[model samples]
Target chain A: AGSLNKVILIGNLGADPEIRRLNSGDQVANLRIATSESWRDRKERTEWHNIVIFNENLVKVVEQYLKKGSKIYIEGQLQTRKWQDQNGNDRYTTEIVLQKYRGELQMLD
Target chain B: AGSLNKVILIGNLGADPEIRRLNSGDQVANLRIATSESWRDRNTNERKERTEWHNIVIFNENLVKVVEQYLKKGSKIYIEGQLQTRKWQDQNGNDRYTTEIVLQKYRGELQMLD
Candidate 1:
C-alpha cells in the first residue's frame, strides 16, 4: 500500500546540535527541539523532539547558524530504532529524521 | 511567543473512530492511525521496518461527520493537526496527560488517500 510518515515542527532548540563524522566524510547532526501548545483553558504544555539530520548541506547550515534557543522549522520523517544502552540494556528511540534529498530545515529566528 | 504545533500523517486506520457528543451537541471523533517505514540496513544489506501509532482527535463538527460517514478500519487518509497534550484523571483518580493530534474548528486538513 502507498504510505507516508512525516513530521513538521516549528520550535526552539533545547541545545546545540550534536555533530558526528561518518567514514565517508559526510557530517551528521542531531538536535533537541522544544515545541509547545496552549489553549484558552489556561494551561500550556511543551514537547521535546529528537531530530537527526543526514543531509550534509543541512548539517553544515545547522553547524554554522544554529544554537541553543534558535527557532527553526523542520520537515522530516519519523523513525524508531532499537539499540542497546551503556549497560547493554535494550532501548527504543523515536526520532524525526532528515535524509539527503528528502527532508528540509529553515531558520525562523 | 507565538507558536505552531502541527502534525501530518498518511496512514491507515486501526479501527473505526470512537465518537462522542458534547454537552452543546457538538460531536468529536477519536482515531487510531498507524504509519510505518522500511529501509535498507547499511551493515548487512537487509531491510528493517518500524511502525508508529498515533492518537488523533477531531473537534471540528464537519470533520467529525465526515469521519463518521466515511472512515473505517484500514482506510488510508492524510491529516493535518496540532499537537496537544491534555491532562485528565485516570481510573485511579490521578492526573495523567495524553498527547494527541488535534483538529480544531476550521483549522486543519483531511483528505482520503485511498
Candidate 2:
C-alpha cells in the first residue's frame, strides 16, 4: 500500500488568524483551535490543535470570515515542517494544514 | 452551529484486533494504528520522516463484523472518527484515563486493504 494523510477537525477558534506574506510572496496564516471531549465518568476536557493555511486563497477566506469563538469544520492533512529554535537547534512541528482542492474549511458559526 | 469532534486516519494496523463483549452485550474491538509523514527542509537537507501512533476503538456493528474477518496486524486501513476519553479505576484503585478514536456511522468510515 502506498499511503494517505488526512485530518478532520471540528473546533472553536482561540484567536483571529494572522496572515503573513512569505519572501516568495505567497500567503500563509496560523490559527489555534480547541476541541473538547467528555464521558460519563470524567469531566469534559478540551484539546487544542494548531492549524496553518498553505493554500494561498484560503487565507483570504479565513481573514474575511473567521474570528475567535467561531466554531468551524476543517478537512485537511497532517503536515510536518522543519524549524529552528532560538538557539538555532533544529525543531520540527506538525500541523493540520489546508491545501487547495485536497482540503476544506467551512464556517460553522 | 453545533460543535464538532472528528478524526481521519490512513495507516496500517500494529496488531490484530481482540473483540470483547460488554455487559450490555455490545461487541467492541481495539486497533493500534501507525501514521507517518515525510518532508524535505533546509535544516535537514533531505527528506525526514516522522511516525505517529494512535489507539482506536470500534463500536459500530458493521465494522465489528468487518474486523473479525478482515482486520489483522499490518493491515492497511482508512478510518475517520471523533476523539473520546474514557475514565476508569486502575487495579490499585487509582483513577485512570484512555483516549481513543471512536467510530460512528453518522460521521465515520472504515476501509480495509487486505
Candidate 3:
C-alpha cells in the first residue's frame, strides 16, 4: 500500500546536452529543462530541473533528439545521488533520472 | 533560470475516496495512492522492486466530480501536476508543512488507468 514515484515533463531545454561515461563505464547524459506558467492576469515564472539519463541508448537519444530550445515530453523517476565536492564536503543532488531504454523517452513526433 | 518543481504518479488507490466537503461546501477528499516497479540488478541478476505512496489533492471542481463518481478503491490512474507545499499552524501550536500534488490551473493532468 505504499510505493510510487513518477515524474513527467513537457518543457524546453535551456542548453545543449552533455554526455560522458561514468566510472562504472555506463553511458549517461545531463540536461537542464525548464517548465513555466502564468496565473490569471499575472506574469509567468520559470522552473528548471536537472535530468539525468543513464541508459546508453538514451544517451544517443540526447544527442540526436534533444538540443537547446527543444521542447520534449518525458516520464521518469526521482533519484538522489550523493557525492563529495571539490572541497571534500559531503553533498547530494536529487534529479529526475530515466529508468529504461524503451518508452522512457517521448520528446516529439 | 530559476526553479521548476513537478510530480507525476501512476498507481492504484487503496480504498474508496472519502469526499469531505470543505471550503464553503466544496466536495473534497484525499486519496491513498501507491506506485511501484521492478528491475533486474546488473550484478545480482535478481529482481528488485519498490513502491512509493503519495497523498494527492484533487481540487478541480469538474474533475473532482468525475473522480468521485467513477473512482473507487483499487482504481488505477495517472496524474500530472506540480508539487506544492503549504505551511500552517497545527493543533500543537507549531509550524508544519505539507507538500501536495496540485492539479488545478497551471498544474493539470489526470487520466484513468483502469
Candidate 4:
C-alpha cells in the first residue's frame, strides 16, 4: 500500500525563525507564516499558519537566508506530536513538517 | 502575501481509466486510486488496513502523455493536486455529487519483479 499526505503554503514570515537543538543533536527551526485573503467583507482578514522544518540542511538554509517579511513557498506534511509537559499534563500539537521549499524573497527586490 | 495549497498522493489505480472528450475539445480521464496502511489492533491482536480511492483530473499535455505512457491498471503514481467538486444529474434524473483532485503534477513508474 502507498500513502501520500502533504501540505503546501505560500506566505510571508511573521517573524524571525526560532531555532532549537534536540537531544539527538538534530536541529529544528520554527516559523509563523501569514496568508491573507481580501474579500467583500469590507475588511481585510488574515490567516496565520505555523510551520516547522526538521531537515538539518533545510534548517540551516532557512536560518541563514530567510528573514521576517520574506516570502516563501513551503511543501510539507502535517505531523501531530504528543508529549507530557513539566506539569505532567499530556500535550498534543499539530505542525507542518517542511520537505521542500523555494524562497521568493528575491522577487520583491 | 503568496498562497499555495496543494495535495499529493502515491497509490495504485483500481480500475481502467474512463476517457471522455468535452465540448471544448478538452480530454478528461477519470480513475480510482487506492492507498492502504496496516496497523495493529490491540484488542483483537490483529492488524487491519483500509484503502481510499480518489478521482483525479489532469489537464495538461505533458501530464496527459505521461499518464497514458507510463500508467496502467495497478500502476503506482505520485500526484499533486487540489480538491474540487462537481454537481450533475445521473441517468435516473437524480442529483450526483463528486469530489476530485485536479492534478497539478503527476509521475508514474514501474516496479521490478525480478
The alpha-carbon RMSD over the true interface for every model, in angstroms, is 3.3, 4.9, 6.0, 7.0
After superposition, candidate 1 runs with Cα above 4 Å error = A18-30, A34-60, A79-95, A99-102, B1-3, B86-97
- Candidate of highest TM-score: 1
TM-score of each: 0.72, 0.61, 0.61, 0.47
Off by over 4 Å in 2: A14-66, A76-109, B86-98, B105-107
Q: Weakest 10 consecutive residues, lDDT, candidate 2 chain B?
A: B90-99
Best by lDDT: 1
Model 3 chain A, TM-score vs. native: 0.82
Q: Per-candidate DockQ versus the true complex?
A: 0.40, 0.25, 0.22, 0.26
- Could you tell me how far off, in angstroms, the CA of residue A62 lies in candidate 3 after the best superposition? 2.6
Across B42-90, the per-residue lDDT of candidate 2 in tens digits comes to: 4557977777667788888889888888988999998888766566875
Pairs of residues at least 3 apart in sequence or in different chains that clash in candidate 4: none
- Report the lDDT tens digits of candidate 1 across residue range A17-64: 899998977789999888876678378778778899998889989999
Better of 1 and 3 by lDDT: 1
| Cα lDDT listed for each candidate | 0.83, 0.76, 0.72, 0.63
* CA lDDT for candidate 1: 0.83
Clashing pairs in 3: A3-B35, A3-B51, A3-B52, A4-B35, A4-B51, A4-B52, A47-B3, A47-B4, A48-B4
TM-score of 2: 0.61
- Candidate 1 lDDT score at position A95: 75
